[model samples]
Target: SSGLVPRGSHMVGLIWAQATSGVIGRGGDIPWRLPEDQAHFREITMGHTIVMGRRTWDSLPAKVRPLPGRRNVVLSRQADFMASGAEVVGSLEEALTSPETWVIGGGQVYALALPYATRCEVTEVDIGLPREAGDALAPVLDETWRGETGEWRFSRSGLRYRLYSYHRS
Candidate 1:
Protein backbone atom coordinates (compact mmCIF):
# COMPACT_ATOMS: atom_id res chain seq x y z
CA SER A 1 0.00 0.00 0.00
CA SER A 2 1.53 3.29 -1.12
CA GLY A 3 1.26 6.27 1.23
CA LEU A 4 -0.82 8.60 -0.91
CA VAL A 5 -4.49 9.41 -1.10
CA PRO A 6 -6.34 12.70 -1.29
CA ARG A 7 -8.05 12.84 2.10
CA GLY A 8 -10.46 15.65 1.19
CA SER A 9 -11.09 19.19 -0.12
CA HIS A 10 -7.99 19.74 -2.26
CA MET A 11 -9.99 18.24 -5.08
CA VAL A 12 -13.04 20.07 -3.85
CA GLY A 13 -14.34 23.37 -5.16
CA LEU A 14 -16.64 25.26 -2.83
CA ILE A 15 -19.58 26.41 -4.98
CA TRP A 16 -22.12 28.90 -3.70
CA ALA A 17 -23.44 32.38 -4.31
CA GLN A 18 -23.99 35.57 -2.35
CA ALA A 19 -25.06 38.93 -3.61
CA THR A 20 -22.01 41.10 -3.83
CA SER A 21 -23.78 43.56 -1.59
CA GLY A 22 -26.11 41.46 0.55
CA VAL A 23 -25.84 38.44 2.77
CA ILE A 24 -26.75 35.12 1.21
CA GLY A 25 -29.37 33.66 3.45
CA ARG A 26 -30.21 30.05 4.18
CA GLY A 27 -30.88 27.79 1.24
CA GLY A 28 -34.59 27.53 2.02
CA ASP A 29 -35.15 31.26 2.32
CA ILE A 30 -32.97 33.55 0.27
CA PRO A 31 -34.97 36.74 -0.07
CA TRP A 32 -33.89 37.35 -3.64
CA ARG A 33 -34.21 34.91 -6.54
CA LEU A 34 -31.77 34.52 -9.43
CA PRO A 35 -32.79 31.99 -12.05
CA GLU A 36 -29.68 32.68 -14.09
CA ASP A 37 -27.44 31.99 -11.14
CA GLN A 38 -29.35 28.81 -10.38
CA ALA A 39 -28.86 27.76 -13.98
CA HIS A 40 -25.16 28.51 -13.67
CA PHE A 41 -25.03 26.41 -10.50
CA ARG A 42 -26.68 23.52 -12.31
CA GLU A 43 -24.39 23.59 -15.34
CA ILE A 44 -21.04 23.83 -13.57
CA THR A 45 -21.95 21.22 -10.95
CA MET A 46 -23.47 18.61 -13.24
CA GLY A 47 -20.58 16.14 -13.13
CA HIS A 48 -18.86 16.72 -9.81
CA THR A 49 -19.38 14.79 -6.60
CA ILE A 50 -21.16 16.96 -4.04
CA VAL A 51 -20.76 17.08 -0.26
CA MET A 52 -23.04 18.94 2.09
CA GLY A 53 -24.18 18.95 5.68
CA ARG A 54 -27.57 17.51 6.58
CA ARG A 55 -29.02 20.98 6.92
CA THR A 56 -28.15 21.68 3.30
CA TRP A 57 -29.72 18.37 2.39
CA ASP A 58 -32.81 19.29 4.34
CA SER A 59 -32.99 22.56 2.48
CA LEU A 60 -32.90 21.03 -0.98
CA PRO A 61 -36.23 20.55 -2.68
CA ALA A 62 -37.88 17.49 -1.13
CA LYS A 63 -38.86 16.06 -4.51
CA VAL A 64 -35.25 16.18 -5.66
CA ARG A 65 -33.90 14.95 -2.28
CA PRO A 66 -30.41 13.88 -3.23
CA LEU A 67 -30.28 16.13 -6.30
CA PRO A 68 -29.99 14.46 -9.71
CA GLY A 69 -26.88 13.28 -11.55
CA ARG A 70 -23.34 12.99 -10.17
CA ARG A 71 -22.65 11.42 -6.77
CA ASN A 72 -24.26 13.10 -3.79
CA VAL A 73 -22.38 12.63 -0.52
CA VAL A 74 -24.23 13.92 2.49
CA LEU A 75 -22.41 14.37 5.82
CA SER A 76 -24.56 13.83 8.85
CA ARG A 77 -24.11 12.56 12.40
CA GLN A 78 -27.59 11.17 12.94
CA ALA A 79 -27.31 7.56 14.16
CA ASP A 80 -30.33 6.40 12.23
CA PHE A 81 -29.98 8.75 9.32
CA MET A 82 -30.69 7.66 5.79
CA ALA A 83 -30.80 9.88 2.72
CA SER A 84 -32.60 8.30 -0.19
CA GLY A 85 -30.60 8.32 -3.46
CA ALA A 86 -27.51 9.71 -1.73
CA GLU A 87 -24.41 8.31 -0.12
CA VAL A 88 -24.39 9.17 3.56
CA VAL A 89 -20.93 9.66 5.05
CA GLY A 90 -20.71 10.38 8.75
CA SER A 91 -17.42 12.27 8.56
CA LEU A 92 -15.61 14.61 6.16
CA GLU A 93 -12.80 12.10 5.63
CA GLU A 94 -15.24 9.59 4.19
CA ALA A 95 -16.45 12.16 1.73
CA LEU A 96 -13.02 12.80 0.27
CA THR A 97 -11.83 11.25 -3.00
CA SER A 98 -11.03 12.06 -6.58
CA PRO A 99 -13.66 12.69 -9.30
CA GLU A 100 -13.54 16.47 -8.88
CA THR A 101 -15.72 17.16 -5.88
CA TRP A 102 -17.72 20.25 -5.03
CA VAL A 103 -18.80 21.25 -1.55
CA ILE A 104 -22.27 22.58 -2.22
CA GLY A 105 -22.70 24.01 1.20
CA GLY A 106 -24.10 25.51 4.35
CA GLY A 107 -21.65 27.26 6.72
CA GLN A 108 -20.79 24.29 8.97
CA VAL A 109 -19.68 22.11 6.07
CA TYR A 110 -17.94 25.01 4.38
CA ALA A 111 -15.94 25.87 7.50
CA LEU A 112 -14.81 22.28 7.92
CA ALA A 113 -13.67 22.04 4.30
CA LEU A 114 -12.09 25.49 4.03
CA PRO A 115 -8.58 24.55 5.12
CA TYR A 116 -8.37 21.83 2.51
CA ALA A 117 -10.46 23.45 -0.18
CA THR A 118 -8.90 23.86 -3.62
CA ARG A 119 -11.02 26.48 -5.22
CA CYS A 120 -13.62 29.03 -4.29
CA GLU A 121 -16.25 29.30 -7.00
CA VAL A 122 -18.65 32.08 -6.25
CA THR A 123 -21.39 33.66 -8.34
CA GLU A 124 -21.37 37.11 -6.86
CA VAL A 125 -24.55 39.08 -7.36
CA ASP A 126 -25.32 42.75 -6.91
CA ILE A 127 -28.36 43.42 -4.81
CA GLY A 128 -29.23 45.87 -2.05
CA LEU A 129 -31.17 43.99 0.56
CA PRO A 130 -33.59 45.55 3.02
CA ARG A 131 -31.86 43.74 5.87
CA GLU A 132 -29.68 40.75 6.68
CA ALA A 133 -31.87 37.85 7.69
CA GLY A 134 -29.46 34.97 7.34
CA ASP A 135 -27.65 33.41 10.25
CA ALA A 136 -25.12 31.69 8.01
CA LEU A 137 -22.94 33.64 5.62
CA ALA A 138 -20.69 32.61 2.76
CA PRO A 139 -17.13 31.65 3.66
CA VAL A 140 -14.63 34.35 2.75
CA LEU A 141 -11.48 33.15 1.10
CA ASP A 142 -8.52 33.58 3.42
CA GLU A 143 -5.89 36.28 2.98
CA THR A 144 -3.53 33.91 1.19
CA TRP A 145 -5.96 33.13 -1.63
CA ARG A 146 -5.96 34.66 -5.12
CA GLY A 147 -8.88 35.00 -7.52
CA GLU A 148 -10.04 35.77 -11.06
CA THR A 149 -13.30 37.62 -11.47
CA GLY A 150 -15.49 37.72 -14.54
CA GLU A 151 -17.06 40.85 -15.91
CA TRP A 152 -20.49 41.67 -14.53
CA ARG A 153 -23.59 40.67 -16.44
CA PHE A 154 -27.09 42.05 -16.03
CA SER A 155 -30.00 39.87 -15.01
CA ARG A 156 -33.65 40.18 -15.91
CA SER A 157 -34.24 41.31 -12.38
CA GLY A 158 -32.07 44.35 -13.19
CA LEU A 159 -29.25 43.20 -10.96
CA ARG A 160 -25.62 42.70 -11.99
CA TYR A 161 -23.43 39.74 -11.18
CA ARG A 162 -20.15 38.02 -11.96
CA LEU A 163 -18.41 34.74 -11.36
CA TYR A 164 -15.46 34.99 -8.98
CA SER A 165 -13.08 32.05 -8.98
CA TYR A 166 -10.32 31.76 -6.37
CA HIS A 167 -7.41 29.49 -5.69
CA ARG A 168 -5.49 28.60 -2.56
CA SER A 169 -2.26 30.52 -2.23
Candidate 2:
Protein backbone atom coordinates (compact mmCIF):
# COMPACT_ATOMS: atom_id res chain seq x y z
CA SER A 1 0.00 0.00 0.00
CA SER A 2 2.88 2.37 -0.74
CA GLY A 3 0.51 4.73 -2.48
CA LEU A 4 1.34 2.46 -5.45
CA VAL A 5 -0.14 -0.90 -6.38
CA PRO A 6 -3.77 -1.96 -6.31
CA ARG A 7 -5.59 -2.67 -3.05
CA GLY A 8 -7.10 -5.67 -4.81
CA SER A 9 -7.71 -7.65 -1.50
CA HIS A 10 -5.56 -10.37 -3.06
CA MET A 11 -2.15 -8.81 -3.59
CA VAL A 12 0.34 -11.43 -4.68
CA GLY A 13 3.90 -10.82 -3.52
CA LEU A 14 7.00 -12.96 -3.96
CA ILE A 15 9.10 -13.48 -0.86
CA TRP A 16 12.44 -15.31 -0.81
CA ALA A 17 15.98 -15.55 0.48
CA GLN A 18 18.84 -15.73 -1.96
CA ALA A 19 22.60 -15.68 -2.27
CA THR A 20 24.65 -12.96 -3.91
CA SER A 21 24.50 -14.81 -7.19
CA GLY A 22 20.71 -14.94 -7.09
CA VAL A 23 20.50 -18.57 -6.16
CA ILE A 24 17.67 -19.59 -3.92
CA GLY A 25 18.52 -23.26 -3.50
CA ARG A 26 20.51 -26.18 -4.82
CA GLY A 27 18.85 -29.54 -5.31
CA GLY A 28 16.22 -28.52 -2.76
CA ASP A 29 18.82 -27.51 -0.22
CA ILE A 30 20.03 -24.07 0.72
CA PRO A 31 23.79 -23.69 0.95
CA TRP A 32 23.63 -21.23 3.82
CA ARG A 33 21.88 -21.38 7.19
CA LEU A 34 20.90 -17.99 8.59
CA PRO A 35 18.43 -17.96 11.44
CA GLU A 36 17.82 -14.21 11.24
CA ASP A 37 16.53 -14.51 7.70
CA GLN A 38 14.26 -17.37 8.70
CA ALA A 39 12.89 -15.35 11.58
CA HIS A 40 12.27 -12.36 9.33
CA PHE A 41 10.36 -14.58 6.93
CA ARG A 42 8.27 -15.94 9.75
CA GLU A 43 7.63 -12.49 11.15
CA ILE A 44 6.39 -11.12 7.84
CA THR A 45 4.41 -14.14 6.71
CA MET A 46 2.75 -15.34 9.85
CA GLY A 47 -1.06 -15.02 9.79
CA HIS A 48 -1.07 -14.25 6.08
CA THR A 49 -2.16 -16.79 3.46
CA ILE A 50 0.86 -18.34 1.75
CA VAL A 51 0.84 -19.91 -1.71
CA MET A 52 3.53 -22.40 -2.54
CA GLY A 53 3.86 -25.27 -4.97
CA ARG A 54 3.82 -28.91 -3.94
CA ARG A 55 7.57 -29.14 -4.30
CA THR A 56 7.98 -26.11 -2.08
CA TRP A 57 5.72 -27.73 0.48
CA ASP A 58 7.92 -30.83 0.37
CA SER A 59 10.97 -28.67 1.02
CA LEU A 60 9.68 -27.77 4.45
CA PRO A 61 10.81 -29.90 7.38
CA ALA A 62 8.34 -32.67 8.15
CA LYS A 63 7.54 -31.32 11.58
CA VAL A 64 6.75 -27.85 10.25
CA ARG A 65 4.91 -28.86 7.08
CA PRO A 66 2.10 -26.38 7.03
CA LEU A 67 4.28 -23.67 8.58
CA PRO A 68 2.58 -22.89 11.86
CA GLY A 69 0.43 -19.75 12.32
CA ARG A 70 -0.23 -19.18 8.63
CA ARG A 71 -2.84 -20.24 6.14
CA ASN A 72 -1.09 -22.65 3.80
CA VAL A 73 -2.26 -22.99 0.24
CA VAL A 74 -0.38 -25.73 -1.57
CA LEU A 75 -0.55 -25.81 -5.34
CA SER A 76 -0.66 -29.21 -7.00
CA ARG A 77 -2.03 -30.80 -10.13
CA GLN A 78 -3.18 -34.00 -8.49
CA ALA A 79 -6.79 -34.36 -7.56
CA ASP A 80 -5.98 -36.51 -4.56
CA PHE A 81 -3.19 -34.27 -3.29
CA MET A 82 -3.04 -34.35 0.46
CA ALA A 83 -0.99 -32.31 2.93
CA SER A 84 -1.24 -32.35 6.70
CA GLY A 85 -2.36 -28.74 7.20
CA ALA A 86 -2.69 -27.21 3.74
CA GLU A 87 -5.61 -26.67 1.45
CA VAL A 88 -4.82 -28.16 -1.95
CA VAL A 89 -5.50 -26.21 -5.10
CA GLY A 90 -5.09 -27.42 -8.68
CA SER A 91 -3.76 -24.21 -10.21
CA LEU A 92 -1.63 -21.19 -9.41
CA GLU A 93 -4.44 -18.95 -10.60
CA GLU A 94 -6.74 -20.26 -7.91
CA ALA A 95 -4.05 -19.73 -5.33
CA LEU A 96 -3.66 -16.11 -6.47
CA THR A 97 -7.22 -15.26 -5.56
CA SER A 98 -6.72 -15.86 -1.88
CA PRO A 99 -6.56 -13.22 0.86
CA GLU A 100 -3.24 -11.44 0.19
CA THR A 101 -1.17 -14.46 -0.74
CA TRP A 102 2.57 -14.26 -0.33
CA VAL A 103 4.03 -16.57 -3.00
CA ILE A 104 6.75 -18.32 -1.04
CA GLY A 105 8.36 -20.39 -3.73
CA GLY A 106 10.49 -23.23 -5.04
CA GLY A 107 11.47 -21.43 -8.30
CA GLN A 108 8.81 -22.31 -10.88
CA VAL A 109 6.02 -21.01 -8.71
CA TYR A 110 7.79 -17.66 -8.48
CA ALA A 111 8.07 -17.42 -12.24
CA LEU A 112 4.43 -18.34 -12.67
CA ALA A 113 3.31 -15.74 -10.20
CA LEU A 114 5.74 -12.95 -11.08
CA PRO A 115 3.46 -11.08 -13.43
CA TYR A 116 0.79 -10.88 -10.81
CA ALA A 117 3.13 -9.76 -8.10
CA THR A 118 2.70 -6.35 -6.59
CA ARG A 119 5.42 -6.57 -3.95
CA CYS A 120 8.61 -8.48 -3.14
CA GLU A 121 10.72 -8.96 -0.02
CA VAL A 122 14.10 -10.55 -0.58
CA THR A 123 16.80 -11.29 1.96
CA GLU A 124 20.27 -11.22 0.47
CA VAL A 125 22.21 -13.89 2.33
CA ASP A 126 25.96 -13.53 2.64
CA ILE A 127 26.90 -16.43 0.41
CA GLY A 128 28.29 -16.67 -3.06
CA LEU A 129 26.77 -19.18 -5.46
CA PRO A 130 26.98 -19.75 -9.16
CA ARG A 131 23.60 -18.97 -10.64
CA GLU A 132 23.95 -22.02 -12.87
CA ALA A 133 25.23 -24.25 -10.10
CA GLY A 134 22.09 -23.89 -8.04
CA ASP A 135 19.03 -25.88 -9.08
CA ALA A 136 16.81 -22.91 -8.32
CA LEU A 137 17.24 -19.17 -8.61
CA ALA A 138 15.65 -15.99 -7.40
CA PRO A 139 13.97 -14.48 -10.43
CA VAL A 140 15.17 -11.21 -11.85
CA LEU A 141 13.30 -8.32 -10.26
CA ASP A 142 13.64 -6.69 -13.67
CA GLU A 143 12.68 -3.15 -14.68
CA THR A 144 9.03 -3.01 -13.90
CA TRP A 145 9.56 -3.02 -10.18
CA ARG A 146 11.03 -0.25 -8.05
CA GLY A 147 13.57 -1.42 -5.49
CA GLU A 148 14.83 0.14 -2.26
CA THR A 149 18.15 -1.18 -1.07
CA GLY A 150 18.67 -1.63 2.66
CA GLU A 151 21.81 -1.23 4.71
CA TRP A 152 23.80 -4.42 5.23
CA ARG A 153 23.63 -5.93 8.68
CA PHE A 154 25.64 -8.63 10.38
CA SER A 155 24.01 -11.85 11.48
CA ARG A 156 24.83 -13.89 14.57
CA SER A 157 25.90 -16.66 12.21
CA GLY A 158 28.87 -14.52 11.11
CA LEU A 159 27.33 -13.48 7.84
CA ARG A 160 26.45 -10.10 6.38
CA TYR A 161 23.01 -9.72 4.88
CA ARG A 162 20.50 -7.12 3.77
CA LEU A 163 16.84 -6.87 2.95
CA TYR A 164 15.46 -5.43 -0.29
CA SER A 165 11.87 -4.41 -0.67
CA TYR A 166 10.31 -3.94 -4.11
CA HIS A 167 7.01 -2.69 -5.38
CA ARG A 168 5.69 -3.02 -8.91
CA SER A 169 4.97 0.08 -10.96
- State the lDDT at 143 in candidate 2: 88
Q: Model 2, stretches more than 4 Å misplaced?
A: 1-8
Global lDDT of each model? 0.78, 0.85
lDDT of 1 by residue, 1-169 (tens): 1223245523767888886653566446565788888898889789778898888888878798777877899999997888899989898888977547789887779888888776788887887654355556788776877889899999988889889888763
Per-residue lDDT tens digits for candidate 2, residues 1-169, read 4544355667788999999988888877777989999999998888788998888888889897888888899989888879887899988877776557799997888998899898999999877677775378888878889999899999999999999999974
**CA deviation > 4 Å runs, candidate 1:** 1-10, 130-134
Q: What is the TM-score of each predicted model, taking all chains together? A: 0.85, 0.91
Model 2 is weakest, by summed lDDT over 10 consecutive residues, at: 1-10
- Top lDDT model: 2
